[PDB]
Amino acid sequence: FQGHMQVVAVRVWPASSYTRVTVESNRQLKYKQFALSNPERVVVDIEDVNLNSVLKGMAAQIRADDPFIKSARVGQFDPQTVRMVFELKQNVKPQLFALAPVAGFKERLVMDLYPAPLLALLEDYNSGPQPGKAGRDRPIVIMLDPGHGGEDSGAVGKYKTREKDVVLQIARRLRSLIEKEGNMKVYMTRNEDIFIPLQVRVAKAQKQRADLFVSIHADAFTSRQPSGSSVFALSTKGATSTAAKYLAQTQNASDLIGGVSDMVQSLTIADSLKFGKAVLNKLGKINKLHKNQVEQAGFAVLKAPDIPSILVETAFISNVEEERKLKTATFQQEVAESILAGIKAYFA
Ligand code: NA
Ligand SMILES: [Zn+2]
Numbered sequence: 414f415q416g417h418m419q420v421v422a423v424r425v426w427p428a429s430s431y432t433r434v435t436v437e438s439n440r441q442l443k444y445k446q447f448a449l450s451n452p453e454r455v456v457v458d459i460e461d462v463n464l465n466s467v468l469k470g471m472a473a474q475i476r477a478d479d480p481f482i483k484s485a486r487v488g489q490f491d492p493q494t495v496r497m498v499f500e501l502k503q504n505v506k507p508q509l510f511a512l513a514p515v516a517g518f519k520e521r522l523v524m525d526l527y528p529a530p531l532l533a534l535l536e537d538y539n540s541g542p543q544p545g546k547a548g549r550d551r552p553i554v555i556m557l558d559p560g561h562g563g564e565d566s567g568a569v570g571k572y573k574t575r576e577k578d579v580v581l582q583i584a585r586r587l588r589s590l591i592e593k594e595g596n597m598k599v600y601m602t603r604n605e606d607i608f609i610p611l612q613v614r615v616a617k618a619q620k621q622r623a624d625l626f627v628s629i630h631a632d633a634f635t636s637r638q639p640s641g642s643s644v645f646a647l648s649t650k651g652a653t654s655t656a657a658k659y660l661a662q663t664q665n666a667s668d669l670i671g672g673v674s675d676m677v678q679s680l681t682i683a684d685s686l687k688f689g690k691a692v693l694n695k696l697g698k699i700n701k702l703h704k705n706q707v708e709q710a711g712f713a714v715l716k717a718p719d720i721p722s723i724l725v726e727t728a729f730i731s732n733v734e735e736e737r738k739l740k741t742a743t744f745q746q747e748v749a750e751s752i753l754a755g756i757k758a759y760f761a
């Protein structure tokens with residue numbers, strides 16, 4: 414019970430591109446943010462707040478490896494006003510924005526501390542395949558996109574496994590395999606627990622000249638019965654099943670969850686279907702398939718107009734058996750070997 418409090422939760426997401434501080438509360442917060450020096454500090458003042466257990470716990474959320482925050486102290490500064498003080502490891506350009514309650518979160522105040530390669534993309538948030546035959550004239554450029562991150566945990570298992578962790582571990586195994594393919598070059602939209610907006614993932618792939626885009630997930634249905642792996646490609650004109658339409662809806666809410674402030678396209682979909690099929694065939698040796706064909710729905714991460722893009726449901730984490738499989742090194746590796754083998758079989 415937290416009806417009485419103003420601030421109800423406080424989270425810090427340390428990452429190399431930016432550290433995010435989130436303060437969640439029952440009413441929209443009036444705040445002021447400013448800087449101090451000797452030592453470099455960022456200070457946030459919050460109004461209509463009484464200090465409590467939650468804000469007092471803010472100091473113990475600061476990890477010894479936050480690239481931005483050396484430490485955080487909090488006090489009542491005024492009978493109305495809490496002051497948060499962040500001692501810094503490097504110069505920052507803070508950006509603060511407020512979010513209305515949505516997706517199960519109450520009011521959120523977000524502060525992102527940026528420094529004063531993916532930085533370039535987040536800060537201008539206000540190309541495509543190179544010429545030649547990928548694989549033969551130059552390497553195939555693959556962009557891996559592990560779903561979610563930071564504030565957005567993704568779907569959560571019955572036994573508490575978070576989709577964000579497992580799709581990252583699976584992306585890392587797959588990255589590691591690819592960097593033994595002489596044929597191949599790999600980038601990642603993220604390689605840590607950070608939140609990346611949906612359009613930034615897409616833009617990263619256009620920016621780094623991807624030949625293939627794979628988005629990796631472990632989503633959830635309300636029922637714990639549906640299980641197995643599955644592969645999706647884009648449709649802008651209607652989903653091929655209610656399951657696919659639903660996952661498009663849940664996956665597109667990511668930007669709300671984590672929090673932020675057309676002749677050539679049909680041809681790209683056709684290639685994506687063909688690449689999706691190759692990948693499905695390899696997942697079918699390794700796992701139950703949820704559906705036996707490649708499906709389509711309005712997935713925002715698959716909107717890159719010039720790049721074949723697919724979304725791989727490694728498995729539905731809503732399912733108890735598949736939650737447990739997703740935690741295992743063997744099954745994560747089988748999934749990684751399957752995507753790779755599918756990539757190779759597409760180029761032949
Ligand atoms: Na390589
Ligand atoms: Zn997901």
